[PDB]
């Protein structure tokens, strides 16, 4: 038994990135759980955690962070930025993806915080966030 979660955004809310794991292509497996839009690490171990956002002076950002008791509180694990500047004549588009492998304790809380929400292209294809144990 090996845990994996795959969360997609709820497109109804468009002005906030709410994670849901109910659809046919979004799920919790073998122990993953949710807790105020955070993913609760089911067991201490090594996980590959990934997430992607798509966008359609403007600042764009999207970080997957790990919540901690000590010093910085919100410790980011995967972050990426992108500046788009006025001079907008085309249907510009952009996809920040990133995943990695981390050491996590049980009950760890993965959450994602993004700048440029109203530009998000909410879909099972584009905006998502999940992790799997190895």
């Amino acid at each position, epitope marked *: 038994k090996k*845990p994996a979660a795959h969360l997609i955004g709820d497109p109804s809310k468009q002005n906030s990135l709410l994670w849901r*794991a*109910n659809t046919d292509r979004a*799920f*919790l*497996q*073998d*122990g*993953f*759980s*949710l*807790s*105020n839009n955070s993913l*609760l*690490v*089911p*067991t*201490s171990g090594i996980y590959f955690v990934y997430s992607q956002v798509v966008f359609s002076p403007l600042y764009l950002a999207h970080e997957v962070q790990l*919540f*901690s*008791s*000590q010093y910085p509180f919100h410790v980011p694990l995967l972050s990426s930025q992108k500046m788009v500047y006025p001079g907008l004549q085309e249907p510009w588009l952009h996809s920040m993806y990133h995943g990695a492998a981390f050491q996590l*304790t*049980q*009950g*760890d*809380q993965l959450s994602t915080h993004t700048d440029g929400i109203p530009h998000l292209v909410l879909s099972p294809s584009t905006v998502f966030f999940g992790a799997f144990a190895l």
Partner: antibody
Amino acid sequence: EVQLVESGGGLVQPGGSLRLSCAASGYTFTSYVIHWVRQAPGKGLEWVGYNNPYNAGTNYNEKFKGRFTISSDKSKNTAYLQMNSLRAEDTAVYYCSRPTMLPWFAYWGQGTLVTVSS
Amino acid sequence: DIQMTQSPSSLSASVGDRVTITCRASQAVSSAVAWYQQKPGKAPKLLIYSASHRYTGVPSRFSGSGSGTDFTLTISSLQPEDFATYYCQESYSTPWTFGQGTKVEIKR
């Protein structure tokens, strides 16, 4: 083998305070979280919160946030629930339980009784 | 914050009967549901996780099913030690609520 043992339940007057202790043994204490679940006399089960004894990364059922505080002492394989300003609602059996994956309450304690009366 | 709703408050059944209890989720919950049997005064016991996997040491006569919104616990050959209050529980998201429970009185 795995053994959870609550202790310290008893009589508390309304608005009072009481702390419950849960002693662990038979699994490496610091790589598993301790839950606290309660149940009012002959009623359902209610999850209070949990604490990771390694990094103190507690997570509460908000119903008790800033009124209950779960701590732990990995030097003594023990989890703690302190409950402030107790009431009628809060009179119950208080269980501590350590899981397999987080949301699967696997092993339970025997539970301990806090009665809240005058 | 999800609620759960167990179908029979209680039920009488006789040894060997097929006992089936249903629990309905207030929203879709993938398949993250657990089933616990308690007994009197003693602590609950884990019977089923992830909606259908039996737990270590759970008698085969215990079986879990359910899809997304509605779930079901079934016992094939009801023993007398198969008596308690059976709680369902969404393991999907915190605060991991329990249904009301279902009490079983064996006929004799």
